Ligand binder design. Sequence first.
Ligand SMILES: [Cl-]
Length: 164
Amino acid sequence: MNIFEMLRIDEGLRLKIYKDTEGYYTIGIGHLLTKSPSLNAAKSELDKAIGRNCNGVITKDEAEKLFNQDVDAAVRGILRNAKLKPVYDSLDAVRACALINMVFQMGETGVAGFTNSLRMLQQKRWDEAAVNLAKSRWYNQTPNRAKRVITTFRTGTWDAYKNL
Ligand SMILES: [Cl-]
């Protein structure tokens, strides 16, 4: 298991434009297109992103292209973040992927607000951090996903993803 397989499990893969859990226009492997309610605006962003006339749809290879780009951005993001970097550098591999997972899903700015969880993760207070992590809109809105990620932070293993 690696970050790509992990995210693939959490985001699924859709070739036509879809509304995500928050009702936002997205496609591929959780590639957010736009926060606006406009399908056309989403269609525009899709074309701009792919660099061709797609008319709301893409291929698997293009999806994977967005995907590779998005994963890289999250990492680069974390590494550039004053608040995220120290935590990220402090984690073992497996746990680091979980941080990437959250950033991919919510953005670096959103994750940077889990101040207390962040500190706990920094201190290696696994169980304590898992509890704090659960006291969030994140967990209340996407419970099964949030559970997998928290379990990962708690155990340092891929178990939450085994057998899926
Ligand atoms: Cl969920």
